[model samples]
Target: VPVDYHLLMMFTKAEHNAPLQAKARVALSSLLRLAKFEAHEVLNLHFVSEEASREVAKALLRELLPPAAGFKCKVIFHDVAVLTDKLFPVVEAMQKYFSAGSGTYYSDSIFFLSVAMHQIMPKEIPRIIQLDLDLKYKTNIRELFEEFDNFLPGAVIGIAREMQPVYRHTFWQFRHENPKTRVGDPPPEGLPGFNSGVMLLNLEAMRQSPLYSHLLEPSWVQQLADKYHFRGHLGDQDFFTMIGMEHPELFHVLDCTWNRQLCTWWRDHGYSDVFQAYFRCEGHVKIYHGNCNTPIPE
Candidate 1:
């Protein structure tokens, strides 16, 4: 069970986005730089990507993954066209509620992939970690696997609290609908939302236990969205965050240190005063997320 440490990263749009290509190298290079596993274990990297990006990633991976001193590192790629084919159908209903546009684009459905990862990933692979492209490593990635042991009952996904009050503003209309609602408050007692930079998905529970099946019914989610007056554009995180306010038990909220985000654009935009309330991280950060194209500290 502990043999292959599974890690998946989204590496799409690399061909046209040269800046994204540069970010991928930095993220992947830094990941392998501090990555290590015992002789019995291996790091299996799964990239959901495209042709041009795959080629660029392979060239970067070849030079950086000398993992030949020899820590076993395996690289795998899943094309967007292929993934989207499988993804679109499962997430189609939820897309209009979470995405930016009225009409669903085939391209945007993949962001909701984590919601249905249980069906998309094979039955043999029990669990997997999905990460963002804008992250930099500060420690060995192996420690993150140990967190799976702490999942509370019925907790299917693991994610960190967003380090910005972005959700509070995004849910502004919902707050107006009901004065008793605590949807966009700060953390601790508050219902501060989540960031999708890093997520530990329990595909095993999702596929086997029949737990989230009832909770995840498309019409059911549509009901919640309507009540919250929620028309979000932040993809799966928006869905997760909205549902988290109603059913907190379904998620295993990880420490802020895990996916320490550095996006402060919202600080100056509107929620300037209340921004730090959500942005604070107490312990040593394991990963640095340069969200909103922000720079990670040097």
Candidate 2:
């Protein structure tokens, strides 16, 4: 079914660290800018917060959101106090699937699960594109959507790239468990890892799918939990890859530029210079990550 698309940015409060908060702000600021160019009627920003961050979130929404335009930005805080009647079957599945008898849950997996559940649970929204506040983009987001519209009606689309060192270390740990099983026809060398930080999802099919039910089952959850040390295999990245592999016909592959990591590649590949030359230019890049770990250059 042809569905209208809305961009959804999901975020969470930092641990009272100034730097983390600053970085989060930068990410949100960049995203809000993208929303303006996209002319999105609804900007759904979800985050858990209370004090300064909460205030900052509110102010950011006010400053960034277009005033008197037909668009409206809603900021929802996901916290213990908000009595949400919504039942997230997918989150239940993730918690169950990644649950260790130890009581601690796979935090990241749960977040992605929450994202999927959010999209599928509400019939109110047709198409939802999930974004990580940390995402930085150098292209026109609208054009990207225009291109993605050609793909399957309802499926999750993620930004992907060669897994980085931190991700590779963790991913490789599990991927090597069965070396023969790990090797594939195309081989896993430089295999792309879906960046769960940014994704486009079709709400209708997501709600109707049996996958959520399958993931939430007790037996399956226990087995997955046991297999992945409660971390759940590269978190949600592995699951997305599995979906792509198992159902190739149901998915579409957009260029890697959509999920570009701003490492040496941007500079090496010359995108850095291009981005620097443009002022508030928005185009095809959907998301950018990396560059947060370095010292801020004066």
Candidate 3:
């Protein structure tokens, strides 16, 4: 059966930061080079960018698609302005919870796009895999889409746990409040939080599930943030992590290998005592996320 596998990656500000976007370009190249789709399958690579960066991003894609990789490439570019306009209102109320204490800037709403993607994207897309631009695929991207099949009942989002004590410390106050709680404990037993670098959004399920929808509501979002004493700066990651503690069933925890993050800043920061507990993953790494600009191991 022919199917379109949709993947979204951010490429905004390509001209704003040459070094950063350079890495993203490399990420895109490696992604297309390694992609191997089955017959009748299509790989739709979507990029969201604003006017300032669109021309730069467009020029890069023109050169990239010329090689004609085996898979059918649907090189779609979404206007960042259009998408953010629709995104801002829906996420504005809750951004303060997951965004920085400084204030929720209009530009930051796009960071929460994945959180409300179903509402903004077409309904025909039943599922999508959003990847960080700083990624290197270790296997065919389609196989990662297969992880959606493993999603248990009521699981609207498929994601891997955050491989850092980012949350362990973020939830310091809550953990102090409940010394025995597992909110900040290591994985397999703890609700250590999630890494937004990779996500499998089941849009169909998200639109259909009441609990999931209710959880997205501003009122409920506020409740969860207050309950967990969660104040964040990581946008979508923070939202997912805060909610997972209360509704673990809403998310299908992907194996750590799927999003083996390569950032150890948290390790040397203050949690060195127990960093390994959250930083370890030993299976075949399907994708390498060089989060925080940590170089992807050669």
* Backbone clash count for every predicted candidate, in the order shown: 0, 6, 0
The best-first sequence of candidates by TM-score reads 3, 1, 2
Give the Å shift of residue 17 in candidate 3.
1.6
> Poorest 10 consecutive residues of model 3 by lDDT?
62-71
Q: Find the candidate with the highest lDDT and give its number.
A: 3
lDDT of 1 by residue, 157-236 (tens): 89898888887887788877766767788887678889999999999977754647765687888888887777778898
Report RMSD for candidate 3: 1.4
Please provide TM-scores, in order, for all candidate models, with all chains considered together.
0.96, 0.64, 0.96
Residue 143, model 1: Cα distance from true site in angstroms: 0.1
lDDT (0-100) at residue 120 of candidate 2?
36
Sorted on lDDT, highest at the top, how do the candidates line up?
A: 3, 1, 2
Which residue ranges in model 3 land beyond 4 Å of their true spot? 66-69
Instruction: Identify the runs in model 1 with alpha carbons over 4 angstroms from their true place.
Output: none
TM-score of predicted structure 3: 0.96
